[model samples]
Target chain A: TPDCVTGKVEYTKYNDDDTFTVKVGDKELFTNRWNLQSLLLSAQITGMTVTIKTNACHNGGTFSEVIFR
Target chain B: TPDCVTGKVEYTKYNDDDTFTVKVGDKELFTNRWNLQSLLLSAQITGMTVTIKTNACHNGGTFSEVIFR
Candidate 1:
């Protein structure tokens, strides 16, 4: 899943579902999802590890799998 | 949706289920899908506009909507 997630970053999501955004290495926001807020609520982005499951990418979109930790 | 697709170049897909590769901009293969091959088979990417749809992607994985023209 290295390339699956373009990169990893300080997972950031706001107070709304539309505000939910993350990046494994990079492009989490770009691969945005509908239930992203749930993921953010389940865990802390800065303090914990989370997985983003989506297929919302442009150039690199195959990173459609997520891991819950 | 300006940045939705990083880029758009040639339309290509091979003779297999996995060979179904595409790029709206810089990351089609990266945003690979299940029924991609069918898209190519039905339309010629060279001049045809194809829409990609799926609940798939990694960091930016919510590009699940496609528009065919």
Candidate 2:
């Protein structure tokens, strides 16, 4: 899989497991990294395009960085 | 005035006009700085004590840095 995904956020959810999800286009990205819900929410609310760098975790990936567009 | 304030967050609010407020101890701070709501929200939710450095703005000050404790 690619190291990054870039698109406007389509949706976001904070799971009961304390993980967070951000769907950008067709890819749903996950992260247990601390303190990102507000950034995700801001991007989602603004409908801003963002490029997210991730580290592969077998099935999908975990977001490492986000570049707002 | 001191250049910083350190305390647990008492409250936070995002204004309709796009400014954000964070009350730490007895001091109520304001910032129109971009992309800080998330940081402020995280500190508030975690009940983490934080040290905020500010630049004076006449009668009040604007937050410039936050060090989590």
Candidate 3:
């Protein structure tokens, strides 16, 4: 029994333009200019399984999935 | 347009007792040591709409509904 669903995940952050969009149960995560440490390190590592190794070089991006409805 | 508000939700796992929690928007959602499953597998699902099915073995768990503002 699992069907009641909501959505929101529109995150954006590249280098700092100052933006923090939100909406995590109906899908609408956000950010502006991009790069708040990679949107807080990809929302602290998405769905979670365990993994957060950073080389600390900065300038790497990719995190636009989990678009639920 | 949408009203600006925030909230959080607290979740717990049931295998590895590694604690990790955070707040989003205005809600404080986190995970401790519960089951990683079965929080509300059927609390009428909750607000919104959708589904995610999995027929596996061994112990299972669920995620708490997004406690937003």
Candidate 4:
């Protein structure tokens, strides 16, 4: 499994197609899961810390997990 | 302090003007706080329970606080 990336959400854009993009610090992440997108947007607006884990292949796909504090 | 209302977020609408409205179960709530709006959207997408409190006077104003679990 890949290690998680932890940082503050810096930017976000909801694509309206059940997908969204979020920039956390220096990393840009994308997810098609509405729940994950919501969590990312929450962190973006609140400046909250977020931790995310992606697939080991680093493929351009939805995150495996997203956590916030 | 007003008592908080806790329920699942059923709907959300972002007004693009830094304001948003959220329906938590049967209660329709409004807030200008970007942080709160973000949280509300998160809950709406995730189906998480949310708690919110507004001014005691029940005036049509922004919520005082919003919490989600």
In DockQ, how does model 1 score against the reference complex? 0.02
Q: Candidate 1 chain B: worst 10 consecutive residues by lDDT?
A: B11-20
Which pairs clash inside model 2?
none
Per-model i-RMS:
15.2, 12.5, 11.2, 10.0
Q: Put down candidate 3 lDDT per residue, A1-69, tens digits, no spaces.
A: 112222323333333445544433433344332323333444434532212222221233222222111
**lDDT per residue as tens, model 4, A1-69:** 474467886556443243566666456667766566555655765678887777732434457577778
Ranking by DockQ: 2, 4, 3, 1
Off by over 4 Å in 4: A1-69, B56-61
Q: What is the TM-score of chain B alone in each candidate?
A: 0.40, 0.79, 0.22, 0.74
Stretches of model 3 off by over 4 angstroms after superposition:
A1-51, A54-69, B1-17, B37-69
Better of 1 and 3 by DockQ: 3
Which portions of model 2 show Cα errors greater than 4 Å?
A1-3, A57-59, B1-69
TM-scores across all candidates?
0.29, 0.47, 0.18, 0.45
Distance from true position, residue A43, model 4, in Å?
Answer: 9.8
Sort by TM-score, best first.
Answer: 2, 4, 1, 3
Candidate 4 local lDDT, B1-69, one digit each (tens): 364466877778777676787776456667765445555656577676656666632424456465444
Global Cα RMSD, each model: 15.6, 11.8, 16.0, 11.6
lDDT of 1: 0.41
lDDT of residue B56 for candidate 1: 57
